[PDB]
Design an enzyme around this catalytic site. Sequence first.
Site, short mmCIF file in Angstrom:
data_model
loop_
_atom_site.label_atom_id
_atom_site.label_comp_id
_atom_site.label_asym_id
_atom_site.label_seq_id
_atom_site.Cartn_x
_atom_site.Cartn_y
_atom_site.Cartn_z
CD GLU A 261 59.82 52.85 11.75
OE1 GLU A 261 59.61 53.10 10.55
OE2 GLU A 261 58.91 52.89 12.66
CG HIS A 279 56.71 55.76 12.10
ND1 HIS A 279 56.82 54.39 12.01
CD2 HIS A 279 55.53 56.11 11.52
CE1 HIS A 279 55.75 53.92 11.39
NE2 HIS A 279 54.93 54.96 11.08
#
Lengths: 305, 292
Positions: A261, A279
Amino acid sequence: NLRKVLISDSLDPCCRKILQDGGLQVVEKQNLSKEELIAELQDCEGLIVRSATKVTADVINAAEKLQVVGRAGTGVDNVDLEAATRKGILVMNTPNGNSLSAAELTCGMIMCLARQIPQATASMKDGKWERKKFMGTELNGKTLGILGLGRIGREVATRMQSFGMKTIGYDPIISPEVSASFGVQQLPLEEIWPLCDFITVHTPLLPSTTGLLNDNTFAQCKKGVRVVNCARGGIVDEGALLRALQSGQCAGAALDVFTEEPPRDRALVDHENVISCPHLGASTKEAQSRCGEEIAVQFVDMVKG
Amino acid sequence: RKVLISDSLDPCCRKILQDGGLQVVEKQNLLIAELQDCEGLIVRSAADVINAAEKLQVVGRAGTGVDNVDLEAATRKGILVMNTPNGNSLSAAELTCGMIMCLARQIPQATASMKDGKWERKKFMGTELNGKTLGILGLGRIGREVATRMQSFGMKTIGYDPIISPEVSASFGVQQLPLEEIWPLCDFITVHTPLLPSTTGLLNDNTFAQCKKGVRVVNCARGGIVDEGALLRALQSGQCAGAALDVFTEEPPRDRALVDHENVISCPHLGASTKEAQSRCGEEIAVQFVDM
Ligand SMILES: O=C1NC[C@@H](COc2cc3[nH]c(C(=O)N[C@H](CO)c4ccc(C(=O)O)cc4)cc3cc2Cl)O1
Ligand SMILES: O=C1NC[C@@H](COc2cc3[nH]c(C(=O)N[C@H](CO)c4ccc(C(=O)O)cc4)cc3cc2Cl)O1
């Protein structure tokens, strides 16, 4: 013992409020570079972070008063827990605070997969009217498999039950009798895969759950299964999901979380049948305020024994 | 019994339309020469039509309302118009619920961001549904279905329908209030009315003026129930934080201001576009016909 706490990231003033009410001195810093933070931690037993501030083996080792690190959020991605435990530093987080926000996002991802809402908005914004291109699915009477029946899995279950989905699933710790009380039928995993129209994962990330969905499990699913991961990156093997999307074994996926990420590899995000968020599972003003409060309350209880 | 089918119909409906006579030919994209000599008609979508037509008894639309067939020209002849008012209900309610969740968490905007290579966590700060108030205008089949689903999320459901009694709506957990009392309470407002003079601009500058600052609104019902000029003014001031629209006063819409707004989610009228609705309407129309 626990006296003075630094807050190194931005979270609701409800955090500071509860800390000083319970005797603790409080300071409130923001961003702060790897050198900056340690100069605050000189005089501090306590450090409360959100997501941005990294608490690496360096800061841990270089900070010579720090006794506890608090995360106002779920999991400890941004805290070297190996190095913390080595140095006797207690790590805490706020698992309850994000439950409802994560469950709501999961449900929205299921609706989005069923009716291709993200794809339809993109098509409208591109100036197109493509009614034909879209044929969606009614959820009523479809089966949803829920892997993990903790806080989040059971909140997803009761909401998708209202749509007349059948909710089946598996958890190694939750008894079939307890899951039945919130309407989730537990079966062996080998019996779950071929029954599902939709699969959603709500497990921690463990060796046992790394690639929980893989080439072997996709082989057992109905053709056209739809997959959601709003839990942790890597519970769904990203290679195996891309292979299932390309073959049509999987008709679509919704991903809030990725093994890396932000993700460098763009093939899944770029796939037409994939909808994605950066997210956002915990990204509500309500979850952020409850996590702020929950970590403060956890801190004050440690001073009072 | 010759039957034309001037629309993309569910293949079940022909496999149906051979219990009783039904010589079919599903020809889309039409024009008027098609219906040569045929007596008993089925349609989905797409007057001058029936006027040059001959011996026709019943017309049947696999859908709700009749907003693609001149009912008065049909009443000018003998022709009964049937439709399937429950066939699409669940699929419309489900889309509405999905629009509510999309407005709360900006999932369509987040997907577009990600597909641009962006990782935008702060832009996309959303709202929890639990404990919020949903206002439901129209408490027929669709409104009540939306209500019981959004109650499972912990939303308080209030609403208004001039024909549904307060006792009927209390039985599916919707408290009816006068409209003036509804506007200031709502975090979200969804419309499930017919399109009538009384419902044209049901949401307008006067109603947005009484709403909470940051209200979100859904229209999965019919184009025009939300006044599109009033909705753009409310989005421009922040009075409206976002809108989800399945339907537009003109379809396809040529005014792009609402579709192009960053806080607007949109679909090309997909409320009845599921395999299950299209199958259920194809068969509810048969039972109306094949059981006079
Ligand atoms: O054959 C097998 N291969 C490996 C194994 C299948 O792996 C699983 C392992 C699992 N572990 C858990 C688990 O730890 N569950 C507890 C709740 O009881 C829990 C704790 C925290 C959280 C959370 O952080 O949100 C979620 C859940 C569920 C689960 C499901 C599955 Cl399918 O069986
Ligand atoms: O003060 C006023 N301002 C504006 C004015 C009128 O506003 C309303 C008028 C309404 N009409 C109806 C209505 O016809 N409802 C019935 C159900 O009983 C119905 C029939 C069919 C369908 C459908 O096709 O799915 C849906 C609903 C609801 C409703 C709500 C409102 Cl707010 O009065």
